[PDB]
Amino acid sequence: GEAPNQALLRILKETEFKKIKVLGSGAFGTVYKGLWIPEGEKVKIPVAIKELREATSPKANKEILDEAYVMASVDNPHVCRLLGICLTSTVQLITQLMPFGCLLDYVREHKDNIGSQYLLNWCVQIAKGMNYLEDRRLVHRDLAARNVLVKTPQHVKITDFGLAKLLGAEEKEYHAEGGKVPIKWMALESILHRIYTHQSDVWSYGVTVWELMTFGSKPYDGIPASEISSILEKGERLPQPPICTIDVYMIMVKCWMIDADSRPKFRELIIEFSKMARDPQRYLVIQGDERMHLMDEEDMDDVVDADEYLIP
Ligand SMILES: C#Cc1cccc(Nc2ncnc3cc(OCCOC)c(OCCOC)cc23)c1
């Protein structure tokens, strides 16, 4: 009693796309930047191409195809979608280019120009994407700022489905196996029982929210992954970001309750952050909150311009 997944997997000819520059060569393969030019039409589509290292890997090959399967099965404005695959020596995933890269690095190199309206709209958008995934019965499993891409400063989307698992109809949770999950973003029950749920994703959503409000800080900067379970067992949690009103911080804290059902639901996070988005400054206190444009390059507020200083 399960719905057939009639998603279309598109096989694209390598001749149809012109690679142009590598965006990153991490410990997973490489991500390129290019243009997809379908033979028939008269359109040039900016795309990102992801593949593995030159030599063929056994299990890594299955993993790209697993990731292709999930990306080809989601269609939402706040989720990254697969345009298709190109069967070369190694399989290549092709998706829409998110020009401004990942959100984490984005908040880092733009701290001095990120106003409360942008922060709150991203929380709404990320919550919408996640609620969609929940409707599709998909449990992310690696939600974090690094996995949210920026199409434009006003439009972000969730990505990286490398660990995503689709749950059955009467299936409530996923039981994992190997240890390859980032500890500092996982629910307590995940670390203790390898259990994952939509509610487990909410915990990660909370942490993701923390990264944004702190403009890109590393959660538990000191503490090493091994200790995280214990500090969490003692009831410790991430600190209140300086720009955070208690209203916002209470949202992050709720996503971190021990009882998973006590945490909010993505559909509720959307409503909550949406209300706050209508009146940004009542919820986040940021020094500039616009732009913060005559570079003094000094620490002085008794400065007065010469054409305002008259005959003494
Ligand atoms: C298929 C697939 C797939 C799966 C997971 C992740 C991505 N990533 C991306 N997809 C689309 N556009 C990207 C653009 C990027 O530009 C970043 C710098 O911004 C000026 C970018 O940065 C790569 C990491 O090094 C910075 C990643 C992009 C693609």
Side-chain angles (χ1 to χ4, degrees):
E2 263 291 323
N5 178 357
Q6 301 185 68
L8 264 47
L9 176 69
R10 192 100 174 279
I11 308 291
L12 281 33
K13 284 167 268 292
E14 184 191 46
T15 55
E16 285 186 332
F17 56 81
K18 298 167 176 51
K19 294 185 185 180
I20 282 182
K21 189 173 67 179
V22 52
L23 296 173
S25 302
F28 54 82
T30 60
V31 177
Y32 300 83
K33 153 184 165 45
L35 277 187
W36 177 32
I37 313 169
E39 180 170 65
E41 299 66 62
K42 191 61 190 64
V43 302
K44 293 200 183 181
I45 310 168
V47 302
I49 314 172
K50 180 186 188 177
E51 62 160 67
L52 300 165
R53 189 65 193 251
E54 55 186 290
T56 306
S57 190
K59 57 180 180 180
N61 185 89
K62 174 185 183 175
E63 295 190 335
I64 298 186
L65 276 320
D66 276 333
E67 181 174 345
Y69 179 98
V70 301
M71 294 187 73
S73 307
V74 297
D75 182 19
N76 182 274
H78 301 292
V79 175
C80 282
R81 191 190 170 66
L82 188 87
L83 292 167
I85 58 171
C86 186
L87 299 175
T88 316
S89 317
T90 55
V91 56
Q92 304 183 311
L93 291 169
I94 298 85
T95 51
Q96 163 184 52
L97 182 66
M98 302 303 272
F100 297 90
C102 77
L103 195 56
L104 182 62
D105 289 313
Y106 187 88
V107 298
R108 283 174 179 173
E109 90 161 56
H110 294 96
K111 332 165 173 286
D112 305 325
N113 288 271
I114 293 167
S116 59
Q117 186 66 89
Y118 282 74
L119 287 166
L120 297 163
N121 283 353
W122 294 333
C123 292
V124 168
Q125 286 180 27
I126 295 173
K128 286 184 174 184
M130 292 307 299
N131 173 65
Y132 171 79
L133 289 188
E134 182 168 351
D135 274 344
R136 189 73 182 63
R137 290 190 174 262
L138 192 73
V139 169
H140 195 290
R141 320 166 62 238
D142 189 26
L143 178 49
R146 67 187 133 78
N147 295 335
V148 171
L149 298 178
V150 185
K151 162 139 99 104
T152 68
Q154 37 278 130
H155 189 172
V156 305
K157 308 187 195 185
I158 301 172
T159 198
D160 273 273
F161 294 91
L163 286 45
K165 300 292 180 288
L166 302 78
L167 307 185
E170 306 305 295
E171 201 185 287
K172 62 184 182 302
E173 56 194 47
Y174 168 81
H175 310 256
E177 59 296 304
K180 55 171 181 170
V181 192
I183 306 143
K184 293 180 186 176
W185 280 259
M186 42 208 287
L188 184 66
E189 69 275 13
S190 292
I191 302 176
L192 279 292
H193 304 357
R194 291 176 188 160
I195 302 290
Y196 295 73
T197 49
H198 295 315
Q199 292 313 113
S200 178
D201 273 356
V202 177
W203 183 298
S204 312
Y205 174 90
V207 178
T208 305
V209 164
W210 191 92
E211 292 172 75
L212 304 179
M213 301 312 171
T214 56
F215 301 97
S217 298
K218 303 156 59 188
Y220 321 98
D221 181 74
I223 307 181
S226 306
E227 303 191 321
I228 303 306
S229 178
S230 293
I231 77 161
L232 291 177
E233 293 179 89
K234 290 172 178 283
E236 186 166 346
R237 291 296 186 278
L238 287 175
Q240 179 166 359
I243 74 167
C244 283
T245 53
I246 188 189
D247 294 85
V248 167
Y249 183 54
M250 194 100 237
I251 303 293
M252 302 170 31
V253 170
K254 288 178 178 177
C255 297
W256 304 333
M257 306 280 270
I258 266 65
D259 185 60
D261 297 315
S262 284
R263 308 174 191 150
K265 295 184 186 69
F266 283 116
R267 60 168 308 277
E268 291 156 350
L269 272 319
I270 296 171
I271 293 169
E272 287 317 291
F273 284 101
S274 223
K275 296 183 183 157
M276 296 180 166
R278 302 173 79 91
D279 191 21
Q281 316 208 165
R282 173 178 180 176
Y283 303 100
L284 297 170
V285 315
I286 300 166
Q287 289 182 170
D289 240 326
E290 192 265 307
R291 275 206 63 190
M292 278 187 101
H293 217 152
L294 300 172
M295 271 158 81
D296 310 62
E297 245 270 312
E298 304 292 308
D299 318 84
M300 270 299 322
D301 50 292
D302 269 292
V303 43
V304 74
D305 190 283
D307 38 49
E308 269 83 68
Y309 191 72
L310 305 171
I311 98 102

